[PDB]
UniProtKB/Swiss-Prot annotation:
Homodimer. This is Bifunctional epoxide hydrolase 2. It catalyses: an epoxide + H2O = an ethanediol; (9S,10S)-10-hydroxy-9-(phosphooxy)octadecanoate + H2O = (9S,10S)-9,10-dihydroxyoctadecanoate + phosphate; 12-phosphooxy-(9Z)-octadecenoate + H2O = 12-hydroxy-(9Z)-octadecenoate + phosphate; 12-phosphooxy-(9E)-octadecenoate + H2O = 12-hydroxy-(9E)-octadecenoate + phosphate. Its cofactor is Mg(2+). One of its GO terms (biological process) is cholesterol homeostasis. The chain holds residues 228 to 547 of 555 of the full protein.
Length: 320
């Protein structure tokens, strides 16, 4: 395994982007700024294997707690977690740190955010990389509840819409939650289909799940401790802005992303499947790609060595 991070041994930074919103991050390294943006329901600590490697490769790494998570503010309002608001905050974040640009690397919902950052704020994005999450041009002629519904593997997203319901289930036993979620593809104890009908994500999964090969008990307990601060409302609110996000994306008016870009697909991610990235070159002329075999949804901890190799090669050739 690559070198990891001990939370206590990190530099912790805090930036107040608005009077009620302060964003936490950890920072390591000197060199061009790279801003890592995690997914749901994760942490800056999801990047524990990349942070040292990227620093050693000659980059100044800023690994965020995204809004809703960890030491970052977690307001309860749904519309505080739309893409427009989150992206404008990240611009303010750069402004307050005095950074003209950064490289933005995201995974999962953080991948969605970095695409929107490249789309609408290219002047502040030196280059953009996404793990798993594609860029998808908004279809200004079809609604988000026509797309979600069609895709049966997206049914969990409907279970996550009504505030309080998924929170109760995910907060009931935090250890069980993380142990159930953070698994390799072949170790999966969860179905993303028919969640509403089943009555929840964990109604059929083990009460005392085993530990994935990917994670230690200590690592699980870090996530547990982090989610005691604010729970799952903020994190889940990222899912609760589909219409608003679509309307914002429609304002792009078909503009391309013209900065350096990298799309990395994961063979065994069954939600964010490689094929969903199919026509990205048509919108992104300077797109490069990576692909990781035997790699599920939790890319950074499933295949950290591979991630580190792909990102450093691309950073050195295209971002620096």
């Amino acid at each position: 395994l690559p070198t990891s991070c001990n939370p206590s041994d990190m530099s912790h930074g805090y930036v107040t982007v608005k009077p009620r919103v302060r964003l936490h991050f950890v920072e390591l390294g000197s060199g061009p700024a790279v801003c890592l943006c995690h997914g749901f329901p994760e942490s800056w600590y999801s990047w524990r294997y990349q942070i040292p490697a990227l620093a050693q490769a000659g980059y100044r790494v800023l690994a965020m707690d995204m809004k809703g998570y960890g030491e970052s503010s977690a307001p309860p309002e749904i519309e505080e977690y739309c893409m427009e608001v989150l992206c404008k905050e990240m611009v303010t974040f750069l402004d307050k740190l005095g950074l003209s640009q950064a490289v933005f690397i995201g995974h999962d919902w953080g991948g969605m955010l970095v695409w929107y950052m490249a789309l609408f704020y290219p002047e502040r994005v030196r280059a953009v990389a996404s793990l798993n999450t594609p860029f998808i041009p908004a279809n200004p002629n079809m609604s988000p509840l026509e797309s979600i519904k069609a895709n049966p593997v997206f049914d969990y997203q409907l279970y996550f819409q009504e505030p309080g319901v998924a929170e109760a289930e995910l907060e009931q036993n935090l250890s069980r939650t993380f142990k159930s979620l953070f698994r390799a593809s072949d170790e999966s104890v969860l179905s993303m289909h028919k969640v509403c009908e089943a009555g929840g994500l964990f109604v059929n999964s083990p009460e005392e799940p085993s530990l994935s090969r990917m994670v230690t008990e200590e690592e699980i307990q870090f996530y547990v401790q982090q989610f005691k601060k604010s729970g799952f409302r903020g994190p889940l609110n990222w899912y609760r802005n589909m219409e608003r996000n679509w309307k914002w994306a429609c304002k792009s008016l078909g503009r391309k992303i013209l900065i350096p870009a990298l799309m990395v697909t994961a063979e065994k991610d069954f939600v964010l499947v490689p094929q969903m990235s199919q026509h990205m070159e048509d919108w992104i002329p300077h797109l490069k790609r990576g692909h990781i075999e035997d790699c599920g949804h939790w890319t950074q901890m499933d295949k950290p060595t591979e991630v580190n190799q792909i990102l450093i090669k691309w950073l050195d050739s295209d971002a620096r």
